[PDB]
Design a binder for this molecule. Sequence first.
Ligand SMILES: *C[C@@H](Cn1ccnc1)C(=O)NC[C@@H](NC(=O)[C@H](Cc1nc2ccc(C(C)C)cc2s1)NC(=O)CC)C1CCCCC1
Length: 356
Amino acid sequence: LYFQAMNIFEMLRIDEGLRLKIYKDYYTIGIGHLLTKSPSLNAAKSELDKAIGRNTNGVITKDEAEKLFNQDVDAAVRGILRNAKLKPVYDSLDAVRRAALINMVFQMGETGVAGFTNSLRMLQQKRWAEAAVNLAKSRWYNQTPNRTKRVITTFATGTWDAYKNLRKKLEQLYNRYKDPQDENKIGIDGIQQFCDDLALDPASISVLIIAWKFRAATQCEFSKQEFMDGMTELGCDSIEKLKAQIPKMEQELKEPGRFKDFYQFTFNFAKNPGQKGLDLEMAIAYWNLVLNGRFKFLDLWNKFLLEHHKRSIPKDTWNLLLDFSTMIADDMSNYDEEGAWPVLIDDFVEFARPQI
Ligand SMILES: *C[C@@H](Cn1ccnc1)C(=O)NC[C@@H](NC(=O)[C@H](Cc1nc2ccc(C(C)C)cc2s1)NC(=O)CC)C1CCCCC1
């Protein structure tokens, strides 16, 4: 197979993203690699372990993700060649433009691409300008504007310029924030600068919302990969573009499913690496950010903890506090003491009830 890859992996890592842990679409890993149609994680991990050749426990390296991606490219190419509507266009195209076609197949499948009859004909005819304008009129252009414009530029030019130029813009922007003592990360000063550039306080709710959108691991830490992947997935190539995305992120949090996801993410982001629980003072500081205007008993809860708990907060307790805040009556008369809440919440209700 070595006779038949370098550019296509980085092109789809940018457009689709690379995930090093087993996720849901269906059990997937890497750049959209399907593991099984079975709903069993045990089946999914089994397929992944067999494919890789080690006990991965659903976690892989970038190189392992590449081995899997090359298999999917080779399978995609076989599919295109057996398709009577796609084979002529594929055969006629140069190496760079074939990569843009495989990119479309990865996104919407053979049937999706085969639907672009007029555009595919223009490509086969090497009518690059006419094809570029024609592909931009589709629904494909609206659903994924950043990805589509990059793929369209690949067909228009026959160059990697759309991917090369985004990487240049993000790499130049990165240099403003990188740590002088460590080129592969953004340090304390860099994070402060990033927040200043956004006209936001680093301890503000807006910055915590951005960390959620970037899927950042830990507070006061920001890796180069987090910056690169975050900015690309959000479709931002500048601070101004990221700044303009903040109201959209705010709107999402008005939907309870998104809010629940952001709320639970906060615990994982707030905690110290190597620690399973969140120290009380930290838990209170983040609760004041995320439960502000959502929990009537927030101050009395903080006072209770500082005076009667004075210990770390486990994840389950953090998660369940949101359900408590939502259901609790202003007089606490609906609280099920004989129910299944953490002992800490039963003790809070016992402490709070005589205080009205
Ligand atoms: C720096 C850290 C020191 N420390 C104390 C105990 N363990 C570690 C610290 O001060 N932690 C608590 C702070 N948190 C913050 O100030 C953070 C700073 C940021 N980290 C990141 C990471 C990634 C990003 C990118 C851009 C996605 C951005 C930022 S800003 N801020 C937040 O966590 C947002 C709220 C505070 C304690 C008081 C309550 C607020 C947080």
